[PDB]
Ligand binder design. Structure first.
Ligand SMILES: [Mg+2]
Lengths: 50, 227, 147, 75, 227
RNA sequence: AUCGGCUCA
DNA sequence: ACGACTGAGCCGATG
């Protein structure tokens, strides 16, 4: 189902896409998988651990 | 061997935020050198006008709130943070915002002062509900560069600040997005060539024009130890 | 002029403080510990330098020598005092003696994980990529022909 | 000696008497002045004891024979 | 608002080929801008004199060989490639090399012409064995920049060449290797800061010193349309 | 400070 | 018939 939704917003079915590197402004010699993810700032930062 | 020197052809204004910039002619293997090098300055650096300090009557700390207001203090600090501002002459400026009644609170409700020119006259700052209350506040705007938040400002000073003077982190850097294209230039002399198109998006606090000339100055400024 | 007068210049965060710090950390090593210390490499010495933050940094090879991993981990950090303590921390406990392992005749500090894939990606054989039939005039011409 | 002490270990012989030949030598150049021989390259008295072993000098044979010298100079 | 301006600290000569160059202080996110941008010029656009074309009597193609010679043609093409040459006036020059007998064949066996100055008078070109044979050849030297090999010279060109005129790839860039390091520099108010060390290797036709100052000039030279 | 509670390596 | 991990965090409660 996900594949068939990518062809709605037009983002490659492969999920890997072309990006460019900072430092250099020079290519990445292969498509890299990218996307949106739910992460956590779970408890105990560094501030309470040092 | 003689070096071609690239120039400006046309500036394509699309909005007070967005603008492309076309550049030709650049010799082979130079669209990658500069375009990248330009961008690296254009994000990292660049002197935009932004909000730093605020005071409000009837408020003690940021973590409290004011009656007849939908949004919280930190929320209004947060809405002030992402403001758009312009300054002509002096560096540091003190604004006065006074609005009262029902409905939203847009920036155009601040006193239009001489040097002061606002980019977005329909930006969201704060909300009001009850019609027997208002909000008066002294906001402070500054020109700097990069990101000196409130945190690094609580340890390079010892004369001490008063109560009510809250601190927003400063978003001095104006630009929010940038890229660069590498297309083939058709000059009517040589066909080997390329041309550099730099897309940008911003808050309008610095013009798309100066921005480019101002950054390449900084670039060269660094190169002055090797000539 | 006293120990206490210096107790104010330290706390004031005066600049000259950090100056001396750089020449103190110069030629004065450290002990770095991970529990469980199942064996002896669980402690080693590493000549530190300064880097600001709340966080400690480390090598990714000795990752394997220690019972270690970067995911939610912690290291206590002692300091060896006497001339001896320092030098014997350099002479023995230091990481530089511990490339070979105690238990057996294999080096414990080996190219773990990522450092690896670079070399495979690099060295990996082929027959067609970008051009061929070349020669080069030494190891130097190669680097030109890549970056 | 900041990177690797492999040359100065096998000079005296082992790594344990690279301590009590250098501890004794790191002690002598910390108290009553004492000479810095191989250029004091900023460094500190920590490395110096070992650094004298890296250029064909300090040994146990040279710290128990030259302590008789400071017992022939104070008469 | 004022920006830090980086300078030269020390030049560490190791050989007439190799040299590191240490640079401090550069603000955060600038060791990547210049070091890269510098390198891109330093390889692809620094005008050194190098070998391009050769003709030899008694030879048809590069894949064959000549009698009384230890080394092969491609091997002698390969030894010509990595030559050191100097030119004063004109751009393109035609050399004549004539040596005969036993032993090696160094460049000092070429006719010392006016504009022609050789850097290494004991470089290895070719070897001879039997003492009843010799080698005569017309070599061609040119000033360019970067790397236009033999391959791009056989393609998108229609001028037909004769038989015997072999092609070596051109090593115009005098530099043969370059990198750049990004280490930490420690000021007593910001710790983010860095210093730029540029390693290089070359044939000595240009000094490690001028090279850097000469390239950053070229860099800035391009930037002069935006100040 | 002994015990009890609960997390992360 | 015996024997019971190595680090420190935070809270709580009575000799
Ligand atoms: Mg783990």
């Amino acid at each position: 189902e996900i594949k068939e939704l990518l062809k709605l917003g037009d983002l490659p079915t492969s999920g890997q896409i072309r990006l460019y590197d900072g430092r250099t402004g020079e290519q990445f010699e292969r498509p890299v998988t990218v996307g949106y993810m739910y992460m956590l700032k779970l408890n105990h930062l560094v501030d309470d651990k040092m | 061997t003689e070096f071609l020197k690239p120039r400006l052809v046309d500036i394509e204004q699309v909005s007070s935020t967005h603008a492309k910039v076309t550049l030709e002619p650049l010799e082979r293997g130079f669209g990658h050198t500069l375009g990248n090098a330009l961008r690296r300055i254009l994000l990292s650096s660049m002197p935009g006008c932004a909000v730093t300090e605020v005071e409000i009557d009837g408020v003690l700390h940021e973590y409290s709130t004011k009656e007849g207001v939908q949004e919280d203090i930190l929320e209004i600090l947060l809405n002030l943070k992402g403001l758009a501002v312009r300054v002509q002459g002096k560096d540091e400026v003190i604004l006065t915002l006074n609005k009262s009644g029902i409905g939203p609170v847009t920036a155009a409700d601040i006193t239009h002062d001489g040097d002061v020119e606002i980019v977005k006259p329909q930006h969201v700052i704060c909300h009001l509900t009850d019609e027997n209350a208002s909000i008066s506040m002294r906001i402070k705007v500054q020109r700097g560069r990069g990101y000196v938040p409130a945190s690094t400002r609580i340890h390079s000073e010892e004369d001490e600040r008063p109560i009510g003077r809250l601190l927003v982190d400063a978003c001095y850097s104006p630009v929010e997005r940038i890229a660069y294209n590498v297309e083939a230039a058709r000059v009517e002399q040589r066909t080997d060539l390329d041309k550099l198109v730099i897309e940008m998006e911003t808050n309008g606090t610095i013009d798309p024009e100066e921005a480019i000339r101002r950054a390449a100055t900084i670039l060269a400024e660094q190169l002055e130890a090797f000539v | 002029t006293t120990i206490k007068a210096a107790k104010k210049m330290v706390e004031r965060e005066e600049a000259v403080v950090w100056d001396i710090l750089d020449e103190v950390i110069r030629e004065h090593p450290v002990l770095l510990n991970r529990a469980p210390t199942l064996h002896r490499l669980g402690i080693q010495a590493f000549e530190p330098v300064l880097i600001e933050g709340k966080a400690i940094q480390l090598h990714p090879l000795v990752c394997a020598a220690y019972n270690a991993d970067f995911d939610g981990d912690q290291m206590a950090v002692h300091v060896p005092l006497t001339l001896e303590a320092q030098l014997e921390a350099r002479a023995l406990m230091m990481s530089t003696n511990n490339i070979l392992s105690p238990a057996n005749g294999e080096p414990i500090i080996v190219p773990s994980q990522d450092v690896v894939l670079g070399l495979y990606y690099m060295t990996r054989d082929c027959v067609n990529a970008k051009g061929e039939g070349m020669v080069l005039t030494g190891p130097k011409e190669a680097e030109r022909l890549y970056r | 000696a900041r990177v690797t002490v492999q040359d100065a270990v096998e000079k005296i012989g082992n790594r344990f008497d690279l301590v009590l030949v250098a501890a004794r030598r790191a002690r002598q150049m910390q108290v009553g002045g004492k000479d810095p021989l191989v250029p004091e390259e900023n460094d500190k008295t920590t490395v110096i004891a070992l650094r004298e072993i890296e250029e064909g000098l300090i040994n146990n044979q040279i710290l128990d024979v030259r302590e008789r010298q400071e017992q022939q100079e104070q008469e």
